[PDB]
Symmetry: D3
Subunit: 248 residues, 6 copies
């Protein structure tokens, strides 16, 4: 039984859930669900692993998106079909501002659209903006947890390498568009790079769905040295769960 | 006399002000200022009328932007040069959603960039996004006075006519880009049209400046002013 | 009682006028109208100050546009609704060519579209070109009073600062698009920057309206009252030929 | 030869600084024959060049072939040889109902529906004709008494889909061009041709003077009109020497 | 225990492998590997499941890409870092031509770039073109195995839904860019939709890596709404 | 005439469904002369056309002139007349250091630095050659043992700035093309010419088969401008596609 093409889920599986937490990694799904009550694995197909748990007595979904806008768009669309109206992405990220430290938490108000999938939902002029209630819940939850928090703009790239201006690659070249791009984003106050939010935020904001994004800073592109990255993971994970409580 | 090319203001005129309320219309400037302590006229040059006031013992600027991104970009830049770090735009607006009514208050989280000036600060991929603290202050101020408030996306157009898909014009034509565009924005949940936010929000978000926007709905495309005005002043109070 | 949303004007106020002189600054409107017969103030709303005057017995309008394409597009549209078919922009301007000196007069044949409002009327492919009759009248008017005239392309920018590649700013930053752009326009023979012509010329050329532009060189970044009056006489003299 | 395509040297031009540039190589001699001392210089590919004399001054007539790409080659190489003024004389399909077959169209600027113009200036730059050239063409058309329209021309890299012709092998027009002719008509565009956007953009952005005149061969809504526009371009050339 | 960030693989793990077969689905990796000599599981991290096998005495990698250009670009880059120089994608696909049947095999010569990741390697002007030797090996392999084969252009979309003009979605809205797009690709002779080839082909063709693309038709859109695997393995034999 | 520019009727083709399309009008006769019963058909503007016979089948040779625009006219009108397969035979500037003058380059697909291709398909559509045509060209090349390279070609609307030549009147290259040759080179692009982007796009998007082959006349790593192997190959490839 499945109501959707990819996820292998039915509306019954959701038990009336209307909020989903959407990490990138299928392996993080169980870990996030473990922060809630009565978590049960629902399905695992391709990069889409899903669990249901209870939060303050209400059903909540945790479902992985895989890496990138394309797989993210599938998860979000199919979750929406199933009844999800609110999406919270939780990630781990590399900061590009020297003042943003490993262990810090980043809440994304909106994203630089360095992706392709967002364009499948809205023209480039449209902002990849987070829902206000979601952003509020994340900011507030970060205060409840105790994190050092930065709130602002994230660059959301379709690649891990040239789109984030990495030169440590097979070709060692970066196409003209992205040459000198990291310095530009830095100067514009962009906090970090990741790979899913442009798609998530655009597709939700343009379709009457609520979306927020929080991430833990595990590395800094400007710093030479590369605590536990699982400690920063757990901080961000606790925040997304606490935020979800306020959006139910 | 002036530390800036257009505004006719010095840093001294601001008296340490770091926040400016920025209406479009010079006429609205004094009225906004009058809701605060010790309001005084500063200068008037072209579409840039500026007043100073005080909230909770802190200096606040009110300065008009004129219509559109170009004049807004001038005002925001020169205010930034003089020490303004937080900008709160206040406008009146026409809603494009069936369930956004006249007398409603709109708080803009981000704008569709249907302008040219925003591109002079950041490429199109960059979001014309409002500052979270500003958006928070505006939403909370709106709730504190019991206004019917909608929070979300605004379409910000370089024109009043074709860019907002108006056909009641000299030519009666709308360029291909904008034909059917209102229905598209509507389907995407865009609240309203105005003409300055894409520029304001992009230029601030990409230059380490805080910006927010609130507007009063006075008409639907499918008393009010003084309520939006009360909201922007109360929001400013929370951001000093 | 107004027929249009912003200008506060009726068709009757124009008294059959079909040409408008469109300066940027409301404060310059009377000064221009004062060079013609029977100058009367019509209205003043926002940046749109309008006067009516009379030239060779025909009614003419002088109306300010404010700064930038957006406000210009409002003034032009609403003036067209009221019957205006010919628009003559007058400005004062800097220059980006070293051979162009303060005192010189610039007549614009077409503009580099560094604005956004022009795109609301025609796709970028469409030329921001001046009307031939208006340009002819302006060039001939400049010759009649013996002004040193440069005829060519103007870069029309939605910003005063980064789009004209100014670095003396709060951020000191210019976006990639405009980094090295002034040198590029200079090498392409562009005369100057201003902020309204791309919108004016495109919206008129694509809607059967006639537009032209003249400007006095007051400053040169590469390198004012006398130049002002020169440009104003030219635009008024050109208007006579176009009535 | 001093140049790669045209097969010409600086001396072949004998001090010439103006070139009349038709599209068709076969039209070159005809135009040259209207002036004094017409002499064939060279013929390579679509580039046939003649020299002639106008009021004692050497003038070049050189074909461009069809399209911006070959036009850009001819213009560049002539510029290398010393040409500073270029006058295009062409054939055109009018798209305005009031413009009759046989009429003369003087182009102030072009809608850039080409690719070559972008190799000289970004799309924001106007494909605008030189004022002196345009003035000379208009004044020449008046002296000949020709029915003349002055304005904007759509300049297309294709004869078929870019001019929204459906009478084709596929009968398909790509989205960009579907409904485009009506759009250009509403915007007051006079006509279609295939070289002006490149010519005007490359000249205006490089300090070269260019003008564009054409005779109407079809209305998108016979023998005498060619010579009519040809007479105009030669008369205009006289005013630009 | 890993020379690359995401795959969890070391250069040692590859055993001299220079060719990788790259399916979308992690769960298909073992199946493909099983068709060859000495299949050994290497790693499984995120959507990246990798096996090593042997084909005519030579080491060959099978590694999943996950869905979409972004995850594909990571797999290809890190596999290239470990020494892979030839990539053969084996996928599933929806045909958009009436004459192409379910169960048919499609060899892609080049792709319509309806993706974003390809632009991170080459501007849009650059063709998302397959390697000639890889395409030849696939066509030749198809003759060998015996399948109804179509060779041509593929539309490669960053989405499963709006980019493939699907309307049975939550919003039922397809953005302007993609309204009527399927009929357009159909008239242009495009065979099919999938989601990875534009990224794969562009990133390889612009980086001196060889890439080929083959897929089995699982649905025909003009109605709704193992051959291919044998062919990719046989093609790999011809390319070692 | 059945078509506006070429001056040809379907009868002139004698059932030909394949055309060999050089850029230069003066090359048409030379190509035709390598086949049986060569007959001149017409010469209008840059479009010179001949008919010939290959293995008892009629073949057209027709010049395109330089550039996408005139190419698009020739291909379209030939298509109207019944041509379904087009083989471009051109000259080219190599941008890779180890490609020799005289080498034969077979194009798999083109970088669309042209304008005409966009009149047939949006930029995301690949300017890709037909597989059968490309195969025939490669296999003809090995049959005569010519030094051959197969891969991507940059196809430009200009000879000068779009191919980043600086020895020009202005000596300037617009921002878009500054540093472009190094970029294409790094991307493994073999060569520059001016027609293939248009040809390949317009054919691949309209159910017409196209192949592209060119002889190297200059190596751009060394010089901008120079101080019948490819022709044999295109004729031999044509035999295989009849
Ligand atoms: O609709 C038309 C009519 C005439 N011309 C045209 N388009 O382009 C010009 C060409 O060079 C050429 C192509 O036929 O002739 C010009
Ligand atoms: O219409 C289709 C049919 C199959 N596939 C597709 N689009 O994209 C490929 C994906 O990786 C994936 C997504 O379902 O499967 C492939
Ligand atoms: O650098 C080059 C060398 C040869 N060719 C070229 N560029 O474009 C092709 C043209 O049609 C024409 C222009 O010279 O010949 C081809
Ligand atoms: K994925
Ligand atoms: K203004
Ligand atoms: K040509």
């Amino acid at each position: 039984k499945s109501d959707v093409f990819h996820l292998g889920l039915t509306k019954n599986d959701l038990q009336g859930a209307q909020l989903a937490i959407v990490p990138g990694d299928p392996e993080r799904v169980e870990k996030i669900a473990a922060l809630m009550d009565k978590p049960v694995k629902l399905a695992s197909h391709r990069e889409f692993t899903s669990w249901r748990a209870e939060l303050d007595g209400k059903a909540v979904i945790v479902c992985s998106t895989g890496i990138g806008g394309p797989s993210t768009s599938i998860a979000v669309e199919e979750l929406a079909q199933l009844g999800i109206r609110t999406f919270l992405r939780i990630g781990t990220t590399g900061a590009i501002q020297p003042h943003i430290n490993v262990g810090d938490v980043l809440v994304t108000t909106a994203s630089v659209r360095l992706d392709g999938a967002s364009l499948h939902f809205a023209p480039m002029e449209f902002p990849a903006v987070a829902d206000f209630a979601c952003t509020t819940a994340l900011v507030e939850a970060a205060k409840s947890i105790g994190a050092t928090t930065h709130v602002g703009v994230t660059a959301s790239s379709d690649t891990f390498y040239p789109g984030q201006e990495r030169y440590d690659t097979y070709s060692g070249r970066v196409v003209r568009r992205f040459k000198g791009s990291m310095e530009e984003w830095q100067a514009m106050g962009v906090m970090n790079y990741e790979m899913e939010s442009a798609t998530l935020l655009t597709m939700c904001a343009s379709q009457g769905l609520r979306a927020g994004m929080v991430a833990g800073v595990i590395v800094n592109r400007t710093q030479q040295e590369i605590e536990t990255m699982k400690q920063t993971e757990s901080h961000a994970v606790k925040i997304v769960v606490e935020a979800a409580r306020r959006l139910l």
